Design a protein around this ligand. Sequence first.
Ligand SMILES: NC(=O)c1ccc[n+]([C@@H]2O[C@H](COP(=O)([O-])OP(=O)(O)OC[C@H]3O[C@@H](n4cnc5c(N)ncnc54)[C@H](O)[C@@H]3O)[C@@H](O)[C@H]2O)c1
Ligand SMILES: NC(=O)c1ccc[n+]([C@@H]2O[C@H](COP(=O)([O-])OP(=O)(O)OC[C@H]3O[C@@H](n4cnc5c(N)ncnc54)[C@H](O)[C@@H]3O)[C@@H](O)[C@H]2O)c1
Ligand SMILES: Nc1ncnc2[nH]cnc12
Ligand SMILES: Nc1ncnc2[nH]cnc12
Ligand SMILES: [K+]
Ligand SMILES: [K+]
Lengths: 461, 463
Amino acid sequence: GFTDYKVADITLAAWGRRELIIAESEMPALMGLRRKYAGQQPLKGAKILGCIHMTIQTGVLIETLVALGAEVRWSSCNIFSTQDQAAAAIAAAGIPVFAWKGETEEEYEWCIEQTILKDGQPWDANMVLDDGGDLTEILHKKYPQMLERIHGITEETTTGVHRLLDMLKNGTLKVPAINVNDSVTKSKNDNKYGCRHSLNDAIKRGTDHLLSGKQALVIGYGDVGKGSSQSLRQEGMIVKVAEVDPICAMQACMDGFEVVSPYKNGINDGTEASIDAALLGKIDLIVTTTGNVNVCDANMLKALKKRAVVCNIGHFDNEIDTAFMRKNWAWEEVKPQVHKIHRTGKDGFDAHNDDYLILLAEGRLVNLGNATGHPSRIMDGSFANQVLAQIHLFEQKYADLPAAEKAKRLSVEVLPKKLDEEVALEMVKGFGGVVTQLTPKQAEYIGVSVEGPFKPDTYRY
Amino acid sequence: PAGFTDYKVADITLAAWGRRELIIAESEMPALMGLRRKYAGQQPLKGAKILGCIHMTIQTGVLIETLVALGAEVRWSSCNIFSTQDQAAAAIAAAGIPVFAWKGETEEEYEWCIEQTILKDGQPWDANMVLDDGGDLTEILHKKYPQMLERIHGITEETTTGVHRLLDMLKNGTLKVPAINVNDSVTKSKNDNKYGCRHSLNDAIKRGTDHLLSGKQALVIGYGDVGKGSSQSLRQEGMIVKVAEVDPICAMQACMDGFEVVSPYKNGINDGTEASIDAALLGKIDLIVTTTGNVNVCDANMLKALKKRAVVCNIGHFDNEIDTAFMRKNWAWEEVKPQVHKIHRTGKDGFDAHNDDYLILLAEGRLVNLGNATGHPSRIMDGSFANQVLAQIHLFEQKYADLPAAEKAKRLSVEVLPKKLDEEVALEMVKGFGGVVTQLTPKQAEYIGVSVEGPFKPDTYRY
Ligand SMILES: NC(=O)c1ccc[n+]([C@@H]2O[C@H](COP(=O)([O-])OP(=O)(O)OC[C@H]3O[C@@H](n4cnc5c(N)ncnc54)[C@H](O)[C@@H]3O)[C@@H](O)[C@H]2O)c1
Ligand SMILES: NC(=O)c1ccc[n+]([C@@H]2O[C@H](COP(=O)([O-])OP(=O)(O)OC[C@H]3O[C@@H](n4cnc5c(N)ncnc54)[C@H](O)[C@@H]3O)[C@@H](O)[C@H]2O)c1
Ligand SMILES: Nc1ncnc2[nH]cnc12
Ligand SMILES: Nc1ncnc2[nH]cnc12
Ligand SMILES: [K+]
Ligand SMILES: [K+]
């Protein structure tokens, strides 16, 4: 008689369980943590509010936390990223989850509130796992009393970590956090290689367009932009890259990309005349990867080649001025998460009009919106870090300190390199790779221990 | 964890305390923990299923958890009724590891504990490795469960007495699986057996009696590695130490080490009569310690002749070094406290509470350092147990049980670890002290005919 959930179709649970069993074989770091810590139950007593894409991969994470003793209440951190069969499997296992593919904004907020509230009253939560900072923001803004009992936050992604550091500098952060994003086995695995796998995957599922021989513009060349550019280049696209960071621009050049700006001489003054109309007129596909605001703006959208695809793989949809397109242009749904946007007018469209753009996932995270996000074996690294971070913060029991002691432990930290390496070793073994062991004299020669850590904390990999 | 009941210990609530001491012990065992860290990634014991029978101390806890960390499953018991530290056993069971051990077992409970490791859910466990200290588990397997040895890849034997039993089986063709003699690594024998007893013999006598040792007379029976370490344990406290030996080379060492070499028997001739006892000698001895691994070296006539209120103890592996059976049959036992009895020579039935004619027996004649104290310290057992881990990996990887008969015939032996591995254990022990070993120049290594990496001595070297 379990009813504390809300999913699209509970009967998809058996299908979801089949895929969870497969995914478990693809996630050895996470399943190794489950085996190593199951008997010790290091999360016994933890009550975790979780807000992250309700995919099959997140399901393995959820059941790993539960296997270690935790109770959880879960929601997705995006309206399009849930895999309904994963949510169904988690609900059928008796775990409160509120998540389905294609939520409205109102339903998105309701789902988070259903994790926060149990039977109309605040749940006695004491841990937070977030991806992007929406749950974190709601707790600080609307439920500050609940944070008095919460031992910490473990934050998944770059945008969320940015919001956390903003609150820390403004003195508004109420509990300590661990930056899961900046582990090497997260940032340089998930953010880069994950988008390499899943960006062309989403574009093919949404459009079935040939990419070889076509022109792409990738806005940004951080980790997500690096992986995105590779996702397209390996398919044979001619890829151009835009950046505001000269060091990232240098890497793009050395990686074999032409570096261009959508604006003449890189200067974005807000006018149509600043747009490089000749450049945008040749682009078949534009992808935003920045985590910034309005990096594919209304003047760029007006100037893009007819029938160009437009998508975003950064965390929030405001990378693209989709508001401008809702106000001025007529939307034709091809299928879910795929819209033709007719630049001929707002009121109606000719079904055979040739002047349209194709928008994927209404400008929300395209890899999760139009495909299934990152594959299990990549998320294995990110989610082993999440499990380790949850254990660390829960065992430190920040909320039980006196007021004076909380002030001294309020911080945003990363996991130590030794744990990063141990996650990486399990990932390598999952590939069948064999790591060499240093001899004692070789370890002394480079000044490390035989068991690591093998690099100083300044090393960039 | 939840549902785990596959153990038997004195008091599971001691586990937190045991964990605290295991965490300290890890800081004292650099060679063993270096192996745990070195081999953790490879998991060289994955699939190993180890029957283990050795004193269930804190130090054995670090060894057990190292084996598990390297991939093994284990089922464990103590090799002596009085040697278990109950907090170590508790910590191991609380970790979900099957262990049957507590301080103060009866002889029946002892045999029950070994059988609980051998059997799982009423049937022979599918074990494939044996770690033993003294040969009791090895003897039970060969005599009672011979079919289980068809699946076991080897035995790693800890101590002198157990190795002698193995070689007797090899000589008679009754040994069914190969063994590694862990005892005769130099980082075991000339560390554990000698310096271990130097630390822990006077330790156990003080805990049991709180007797001043300085200025009093001691008789140490034997001058092997344990006898050497025991004699130093007492001499360094200021005892006047006399040594008995049947081996004239060991006797020569005693003399040169500054001890008077004497015999309990006139002219060393033990004809079993009372008249052969050097009564004047034994009448001046305040403490006698057996160290031989032999039988009845402190016999009934010696016990009858000992100075009143003398302390009697054994630090060899088995209690039959002392004729305690004679004392149980003829003399009244007064328990002072656990593992400390006054043996009243006035008769069997009852005793006067203020009688002066008694002896003090420690640990009822069982290994006194472990019975009345905690045995060897962690930093010494570090060497012995690093050897144990190396010996387990080597025999498990050789996979004797899986070889054809002709390949078994070439491997059925009792061997020691290579000197190079002995040296690598020693090196970590030295670094644990802050010692700095010098590296040979190439010219120097050529001059004495060795590699810069070692081994530095021929296999004949005695150290
Ligand atoms: N979709 C996914 O699966 C996924 C995975 C990881 C992260 N993310 C999200 O993607 C975003 C980027 O993450 P990241 O780790 O790459 O961050 P990052 O800081 O490494 O990279 C962002 C890059 O954008 C550049 N940039 C900023 N403004 C720009 C502009 N106007 N024009 C061009 N370039 C500009 C920056 O110089 C920077 O190099 C974040 O929102 C993050 O949360 C998404
Ligand atoms: N209690 C401990 O912590 C501990 C540690 C290591 C070994 N042991 C045990 O102690 C015993 C001795 O071990 P070891 O390594 O010293 O062996 P060992 O061979 O080096 O020494 C035993 C000595 O006893 C002598 N001896 C034999 N019979 C004698 C007799 N009747 N009178 C006098 N001397 C006699 C022998 O000549 C020999 O030198 C064995 O049972 C061994 O397993 C105990
Ligand atoms: N498959 C996935 N599950 C959860 N979070 C993700 N972020 C990117 N891919 C993801
Ligand atoms: N402390 C100890 N632990 C295990 N075996 C031992 N043998 C002698 N002392 C010992
Ligand atoms: K996926
Ligand atoms: K000890």
